[PDB]
Amino acid sequence: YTIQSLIHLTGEDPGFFNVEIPEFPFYPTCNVCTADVNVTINFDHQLDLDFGQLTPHTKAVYQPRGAFGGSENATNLFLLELLGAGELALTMRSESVDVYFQDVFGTMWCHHAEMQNPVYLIPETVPYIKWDNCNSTNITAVVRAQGLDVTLPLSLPTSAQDSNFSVKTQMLGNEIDIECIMEDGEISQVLPGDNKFNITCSGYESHVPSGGILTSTSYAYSLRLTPRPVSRFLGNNSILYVFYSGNDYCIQSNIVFSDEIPASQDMPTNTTDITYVGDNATYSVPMVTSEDANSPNVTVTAFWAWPNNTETDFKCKWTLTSGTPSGCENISGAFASNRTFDITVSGLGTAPKTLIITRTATNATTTTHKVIFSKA
Amino acid sequence: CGSPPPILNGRISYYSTPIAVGTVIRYSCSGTFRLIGEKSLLCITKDKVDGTWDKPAPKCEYFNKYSSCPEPIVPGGYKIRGSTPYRHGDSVTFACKTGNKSVWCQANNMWGPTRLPTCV
Numbered sequence: 408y409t410i411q412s413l414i415h416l417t418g419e420d421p422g423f424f425n426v427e428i429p430e431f432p433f434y435p436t437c438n439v440c441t442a443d444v445n446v447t448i449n450f451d452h453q454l455d456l457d458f459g460q461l462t463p464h465t466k467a468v469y470q471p472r473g474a475f476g477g478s479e480n481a482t483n484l485f486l487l488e489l490l491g492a493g494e495l496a497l498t499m500r501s502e503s504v505d506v507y508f509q510d511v512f513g514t515m516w517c518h519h520a521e522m523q524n525p526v527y528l529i530p531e532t533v534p535y536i537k538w539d540n541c542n543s544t545n546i547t548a549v550v551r552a553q554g555l556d557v558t559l560p561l562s563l564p565t566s567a568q569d570s571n572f573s574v575k576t577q578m579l580g581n582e583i584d585i586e587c588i589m590e591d592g593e594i595s596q597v598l599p600g601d602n603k604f605n606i607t608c609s610g611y612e613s614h615v616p617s618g619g620i621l622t623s624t625s626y627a628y629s630l631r632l633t634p635r636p637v638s639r640f641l642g643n644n645s646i647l648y649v650f651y652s653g654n655d656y657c658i659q660s661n662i663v664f665s666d667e668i669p670a671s672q673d674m675p676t677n678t679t680d681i682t683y684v685g686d687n688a689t690y691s692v693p694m695v696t697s698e699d700a701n702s703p704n705v706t707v708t709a710f711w712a713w714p715n716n717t718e719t720d721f722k723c724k725w726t727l728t729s730g731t732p733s734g735c736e737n738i739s740g741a742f743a744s745n746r747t748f749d750i751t752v753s754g755l756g757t758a759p760k761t762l763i764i765t766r767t768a769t770n771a772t773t774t775t776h777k778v779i780f781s782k783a
Numbered sequence: 784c785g786s787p788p789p790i791l792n793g794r795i796s797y798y799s800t801p802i803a804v805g806t807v808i809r810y811s812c813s814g815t816f817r818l819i820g821e822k823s824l825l826c827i828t829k830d831k832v833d834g835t836w837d838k839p840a841p842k843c844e845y846f847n848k849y850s851s852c853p854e855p856i857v858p859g860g861y862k863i864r865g866s867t868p869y870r871h872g873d874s875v876t877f878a879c880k881t882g883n884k885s886v887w888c889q890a891n892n893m894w895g896p897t898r899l900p901t902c903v
């Protein structure tokens with residue numbers, strides 16, 4: 408399905424970046440979650456790719472990248488390629504990306520996430536630099552999912568009173584050149600702690616906000632940098648450096664990204680519920696807010712609960728622009744005068760049906776109305 | 784190349800203790816003062832082992848506090864890592880399909896340590 412997005416480069420210009428795409432349809436199958444992925448990445452002509460990766464919620468960092476545009480620099484370096492709720496990063500080598508598919512479960516292909524960064528990047532093979540005058544605390548900068556998270560102690564409490572604190576930092580590794588900066592003026596000890604200074608962190612827009620907090624105490628303080636743009640092109644044993652000035656002292660720590668599976672990737676559920684006494688239970692699908700009263704396409708894919716097998720009598724029909732309304736499933740779907748579908752189940756049953764419907768109208772947010780039928 | 788040229792309250796990074804070797808060093812900002820100038824530093828080798836560093840030491844001071852500066856452009860110049868908004872000592876990068884490839888924004892505005900570079 409088509410969900411356009413706009414992205415602008417921020418801070419410095421690292422070659423690698425993460426383009427979050429939680430917008431495409433995703434279903435809470437809780438069992439078999441096959442998902443065919445096809446990606447197109449433009450550059451400059453357009454070096455279209457043929458990225459293909461079919462991983463359920465069992466392998467979150469797979470990166471099969473059989474290309475067709477030539478020997479491109481890199482694509483979808485996977486360290487958190489699935490980590491998060493629907494987050495599918497597309498990392499490159501340290502650009503008007505047009506993703507095309509997440510799951511099949513029927514016949515509809517589209518996606519989009521436009522980035523205004525350079526179409527073709529530049530190699531950024533950083534020479535090994537150690538910063539001799541930087542005390543290496545060798546703390547473990549574990550990159551949980553994609554966003555970095557550290558609690559390293561700050562540089563020094565030199566001239567704490569009326570200090571134009573600046574926390575400009577940078578992370579280095581396997582040919583990655585990304586440096587963080589601290590925006591919004593110059594923080595000077597506001598409140599006892601949790602200064603919440605916004606961090607540009609370079610990289611990309613970082614839809615989830617990224618910033619560090621200067622947890623001052625009394626006189627030893629700390630620092631809690633949270634730069635989100637951290638991806639797989641880092642080395643397995645790489646080093647980041649933090650430069651905190653006052654009134655310039657640096658600290659070095661070891662960064663190791665983890666390739667693991669997240670808590671969940673499915674789209675957030677509306678968790679709607681209905682109650683029935685008659686087995687011919689029908690549920691009215693609420694109108695999605697982001698879509699007006701008229702739209703050229705809208706689908707109500709009725710999926711069962713805990714499907715141990717592959718797809719079964721589950722209808723993804725009832726679309727607009729001359730769409731087939733005769734659901735091949737065991738169930739039957741209907742609607743009303745207003746565009747609110749009334750979906751009837753295949754006789755339901757004594758057990759809760761817990762059927763899942765993801766009504767994704769065009770240019771509207773996907774609302775997976777996971778409804779758990781309850782008897783009397 | 785002997786000894787690196789120091790900057791104002793900045794950083795010199797790592798070079799060990801070489802006998803005129805000093806392969807790679809990096810210069811960082813002074814913190815509250817943004818770095819206005821190319822940060823890289825590699826010791827080029829002349830006919831003799833002893834030589835000079837590739838680039839002069841960049842200045843590390845304020846750049847118009849938080850005020851902005853004119854967009855630096857040249858017909859043979861792109862805007863890599865550059866955008867309409869500006870703050871303090873932010874820089875851009877230049878290139879062309881057919882000169883230097885860097886310029887900053889200082890307090891004097893319209894440039895940083897050096898003027899907006901031209902191109903062939």
Ligand SMILES: *[C@@H]1O[C@H](CO)[C@@H](O)[C@H](O)[C@H]1NC(C)=O
Nearest residue numbers: 409410411412703769770771
């Ligand atoms: C809304 O959807 C239409 C296609 O129906 C698209 O052309 C337009 O760019 C979209 N606008 C926004 C803000 O999503």
